[PDB]
Amino acid sequence: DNSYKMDYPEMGLCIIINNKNFHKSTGMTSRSGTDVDAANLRETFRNLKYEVRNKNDLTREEIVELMRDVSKEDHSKRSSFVCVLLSHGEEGIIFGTNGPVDLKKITNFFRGDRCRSLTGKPKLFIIQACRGTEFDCGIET
Amino acid sequence: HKIPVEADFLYAYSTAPGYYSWRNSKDGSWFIQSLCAMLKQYADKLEFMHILTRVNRKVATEFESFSFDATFHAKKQIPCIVSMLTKELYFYHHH
């Protein structure tokens, strides 16, 4: 009882949101190199037997819609759920191509009480995005 | 008879709260590069938190920003593992 049950018929879904191009208003420049990340992730999770679904340049409205729809699927035969977000961001925020979305709004769809077929199963959110504008200058070792 | 609605979530942040996160235009983000590398090398054995800890060390030790703009040069990064998980997670199963 110390390890999650990972022998369901399917390991589960691996949703990858790859946002590279943003609207001028956001002032965010093209995220050069993100496609490399998306491809790397795709292969990595494919090897772990996850059902990978890649989505490119989604508006904040589309991110919410995608998350809602995915949370409404029947995950009964899935051992876990993985969501990877690649975009610009701020503390507690991820960017759609046209603006900010609160990470909480995204993760709430999968709460133990809002996605019953995932209750008791690991829900992983991997977030490659900024969480502010502070630099870590490090320390010599 | 019940579990918290926030239980069983794992948020693997690429960087610490309040900080920038780095991405190389040619090689991809430091965090994703390292995550995929550690998963490929240790997913058949190590528990997830331990894999993520190695990701933390990889990003922390093998990466430092290089920029013609002194303002963005010689910077470092440490990921941030946030776990509300209640059990150990292995990406394999013992038949």
Binding site: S87, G89, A129 | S14, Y20, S21, R23, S25, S29, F66
Partner: peptide, 4 residues
């Protein structure tokens, strides 16, 4: 190297 660029920032997110």
């Amino acid at each position: 190297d660029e920032v997110x």
